[PDB]
Design a protein around this nucleic acid. Structure first.
Lengths: 18, 80, 107, 90, 98, 92, 95, 78, 98
DNA sequence: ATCGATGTATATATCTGACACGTGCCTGGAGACTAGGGAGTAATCCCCTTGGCGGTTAAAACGCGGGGGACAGCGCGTACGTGCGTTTAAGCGGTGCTAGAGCTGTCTACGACCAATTGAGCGGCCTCGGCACCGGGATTCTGAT
DNA sequence: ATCAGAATCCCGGTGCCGAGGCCGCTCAATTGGTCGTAGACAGCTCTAGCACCGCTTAAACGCACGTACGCGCTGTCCCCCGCGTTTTAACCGCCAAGGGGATTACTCCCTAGTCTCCAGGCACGTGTCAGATATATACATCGAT
């Protein structure tokens, strides 16, 4: 079971504009 | 032409006029489309999961009002 | 067998007692339901709909309209502070925003 | 299936000269469902808190006093008490 | 010239109760967002669902605009900036702005 | 007696970390968190079962409930965990 | 017996009793307590793993509620899940 | 006894929130919003206890009122 | 002697976890608000209830202050104003801040 | 560039009460079995959605000028942070009291359950008028003059 | 001040379609009566909150000062808004195909329910060690040297 690697987005909210 | 470009500049301008905005900027027309897409996607996700729970190949207004009730900002008029 | 009169008649209300009693029975809120609880529910629902319809009919008469439209409900709910506090995140279909002007004016 | 008939009855009670649109009837119906849902859910959790498996008059009274703000709660409790003491006639 | 006529337009739009955005591009956007993520083909949308979704979206947008315009005039300018809107989204809360 | 979930939190903690410990204050936090999440999921399943005129809570209900309640990639892991668990349970 | 049939840690009997006594439905299925046990196990494992990492970062083996607060706020989905709740004895993030 | 909430107390709450400079009218303003917030919460809690047959206000009814309000507090409920 | 103590104070307080306001005036305020609804008689409070109330109060206040500080930093100055907090209440909503 | 005392970090010891483990008891979970109905499933129907075409027509797109609005700089003033000395009431600890939570025992009045009955409410059908649209006229400001 | 040009207000006319009333059907509310049991009530007991007292002391209060900071003003520059023209495509109207929602009926497996048995999980007690804490030391350092 692979454990998820997290990253920090520029804006706190999970949703990201792209 | 992208379909999100269909939200015209006078459309968002009239939205702002109804909101009470006198002067608008330029990047408003690019950021409001993004936040509208995000808001609609967050609603449509709950709606389509509501449809997928049942044996329905189509969505209806019932799943929409279920999604808005789940999100908190409820909407009247279509609960029957 | 006596005359089967509605329980809204013996309670002096207009909302149905049997419908809400069956609805609380099928609502799965609890296993048992009291007798006076649907009566209480009907009374408070009657008071709430009467309370909103007072200002609804007054605003409709003010707008020179003899028929209630959903715009009048949107204007009537956002006037009373208590009902505005109750229906804070509630959005009404075909109801525009309350007409208010900005602090900057023309003269 | 809707509460529309009673809505029209109480509308004829408050005003004899005012009509109502069909969309407004749906607005009122959904509003009734919303109020009933919130009050009943609060009553259910408050009755479950105290290990009582019934919803008597006390539960709904304290529930509507918890939900309704302002001076509407005292009118709700007055109407409820008047209604339940008028019901004990049959 | 007909100067300072925008205010009357604002009063008109506060008076009106119709939908501001058109129906066809919003409906196509709904179809596109649907087929974008559901991984299925030909999902139908009822008629009331479309107009309901459009009314709700316009309501959310007008609330966000009035809040943003209030905080911009609080800052000391009458022009709305996107940084203020992005700040507004996180100053309203998890449920109020997002 | 008093109902609590202290032993199961302790078991999974000692399983994921054979050295660490949880204070008594933090143990109550975990218990209240588990109760709150369970109540949220149960209320969601209840209203979803009411919306389809069904009196049963099948595996479809709980999966749809946890998917529309849990956002993100955690939902995609949790559905796999639940399906794997029910197959493991019914594999007897 | 048939307690650890699902090979998990949460009891199937207690959650089944809670679902039957909670009156969420007239009847309840059999896979639903198993599914609930799995999701509760996964979420508790994740939050305890993050808390253990924060406590190891603070050179302490006794996890204090501050460490749970850091474990919740350092992630990004956990705050979207627990935005409506707060933690006792929990400090604010170091800005 | 509202004067017990001292000026350094509100200042430390602001420093914990990250505020550098604080004007002189904040201490006369923070008391009002705190007072109405506590008024609302204690009102709901005393209604919960008035429903209960007991007269002391326990922590269970407090977290029940907080759960109704929208900010559930961990560490004590249960 | 320690010059410029606000930076050290902020760096210390963001790392601490204990409750800031004293217990006795907070308990007196709780009693004063409680005696207005108990119909004359006195109500007793548990040792955990008052602490939970104070925890919730300081948490909500520190959230309100950090949101207002974001708003004031948007204005372009370092001092926060009470009118900004009053705006922040209704910006966050009539139920969350109000 | 050395010494003092003011602030900062760590290394040591020290001690304690909170943690973890062990025991003992028991009530809730499991095993086995039943009966009945909720739900799964297949066939059918017909409403409602999709889809495609033409023809208009408001609405979107585009270009241009100008003004008014954001913004940087600067100077003025002032209000809050810092330091110091003085003072107070929060806090520890400690002791006594009792109101009231909380558990147990009893008994009954209340609410589920069922069968029979009926009228209140639902589906449909109609018809007309309140309201939308439009067109002419009456008044009333407002920037261009 | 003086103006037509919009803008608003009102007003009769048409019109249309959606509101409101009526009719017929039917199933869900009502009535009556029996069964059982949750809950009302009363009593009893033992914790835990309340009150007080007295001592400590760390926190609060006030006051002078200084200097960093709000804010008003000005000046420059630019980026939207109004306006006219051009060009698209949403909207309406129409019909046509069919997919799938919705309904009905059939069957069966699954789950509630009861009894009976026992062990995982509860409470309690108690030894022990991680961590809080006090002190020393090392380190940056700022004022005197």
């Amino acid at each position: 079971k692979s454990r998820r690697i997290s990253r920090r987005p520029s804006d706190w909210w999970v949703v990201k504009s792209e | 032409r992208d379909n999100i470009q269909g939200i015209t500049k006078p459309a968002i301008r009239r939205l702002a006029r109804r909101g009470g905005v006198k002067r608008i900027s330029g990047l408003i027309y690019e950021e409001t489309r993004g936040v509208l897409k995000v808001f609609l996607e967050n609603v449509i996700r709950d709606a389509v999961t509501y449809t997928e729970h049942a044996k329905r190949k189509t969505v209806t207004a019932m799943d929409v009002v279920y999604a808005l009730k789940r999100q908190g900002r409820t909407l009247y008029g279509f609960g029957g | 067998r006596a005359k089967a009169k509605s329980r809204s008649s013996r309670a002096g209300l207009q909302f149905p007692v049997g419908r809400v009693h069956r609805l609380l029975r099928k609502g799965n809120y609890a296993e048992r339901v009291g007798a006076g609880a649907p009566v209480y529910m009907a009374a408070v629902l009657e008071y709430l709909t009467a309370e909103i319809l007072e200002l609804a009919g007054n605003a409709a008469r003010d707008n020179k309209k003899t028929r209630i439209i959903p715009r009048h409900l949107q204007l009537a709910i956002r006037n009373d502070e208590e009902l505005n506090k109750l229906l804070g995140k509630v959005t009404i279909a075909q109801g525009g925003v309350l007409p208010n002007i900005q602090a900057v004016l023309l003269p | 299936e809707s509460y529309s008939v009673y809505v029209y009855k109480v509308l004829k009670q408050v005003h004899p000269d005012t009509g109502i649109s069909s969309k407004a009837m749906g607005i009122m119906n959904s509003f009734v469902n919303d109020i009933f849902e919130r009050i009943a859910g609060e009553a259910s959790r408050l009755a479950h808190y105290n290990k009582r498996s019934t919803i008597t008059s006390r539960e709904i009274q304290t529930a509507v006093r918890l939900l309704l703000p302002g001076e509407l709660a005292k009118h709700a409790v007055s109407e409820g008490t008047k209604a339940v003491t008028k019901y004990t006639s049959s | 010239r007909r100067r300072q006529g925008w205010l009357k337009e604002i009063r008109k739009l506060q008076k009106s109760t119709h939908l501001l955005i058109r129906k066809l591009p919003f409906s196509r956007l709904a179809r596109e967002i649907c087929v974008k993520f559901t991984r299925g083909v030909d999902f139908n949308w009822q008629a009331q669902a479309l107009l309901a979704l459009q009314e709700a979206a316009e309501a959310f947008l007008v609330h966000l605009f009035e809040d943003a315009y209030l905080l911009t005039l609080h800052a000391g300018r009458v022009t709305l900036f996107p940084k203020d809107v992005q700040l507004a989204r996180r100053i309203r809360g998890l449920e109020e702005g997002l």
